[PDB]
Amino acid sequence: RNTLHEFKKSAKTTLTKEDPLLKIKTKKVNSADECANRCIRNRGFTFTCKAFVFDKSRKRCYWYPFNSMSSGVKKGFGHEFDLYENKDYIRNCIIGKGGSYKGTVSITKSGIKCQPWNSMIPHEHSFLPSSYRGKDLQENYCRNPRGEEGGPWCFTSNPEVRYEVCDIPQCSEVECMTANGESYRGPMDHTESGKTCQRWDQQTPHRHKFLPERYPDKGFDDNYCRNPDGKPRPWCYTLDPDTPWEYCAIKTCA
């Protein structure tokens, strides 16, 4: 299995609020991917895991309920640590239907302040968080708890408009490309047929010559679509063992 690709790596970094010790669940493991799975599946947690640090030497990983952007939390440094923040919480963009969007946009297309989900004012409604556990209906952030076609949306703070889609750019269009896209550096991580890009720093399921350390110019972070070798457009090794690689379909700057 695999979930490490769901995460945004920031090397030699770690996290800390400062609070009176505070519960920070920890456990020895073999790999970072092992931390990943536990994190996204939340098994044995009294809370939701947004990020986690892995200690490459001690081979321990620590699970956090917040991330580098959370309310008052300092970062740091550590030669032997790596921080892995879930992409669902930090991206400023959507893959397709936006079922997994957990960023912090709280404004509709037409620009209305969203109504908080813990509220029935102005609009009465069934989407209490209690019923949509793990869909993160917090504050008044746009969400898409049922994975429907409109993408993320929210109840509106205008009595007249009950709900409305939030205009969140698609990861394929936020940073746009140009020429053969050798300069593309945007955050798209899925291929044209919808397959999921394998992380450049990994050699599995596909072995490949592109070690990020040997290629400081190409932007081989995480699993983002890139074009190091001058194809007609950016591309990625996939997570399907049956397809070594595949083009990504990034929107051009028009």
From Swiss-Prot:
Disulfide bonds join 35-61, 39-49, 93-171, 114-154, 142-166, 176-253, 197-236, 225-248. Residues 93-171, 176-253 form the Kringle domain. Coiled coil: none annotated. Transmembrane segments: none annotated. Residues 2-88 form the PAN domain. This is Hepatocyte growth factor alpha chain.
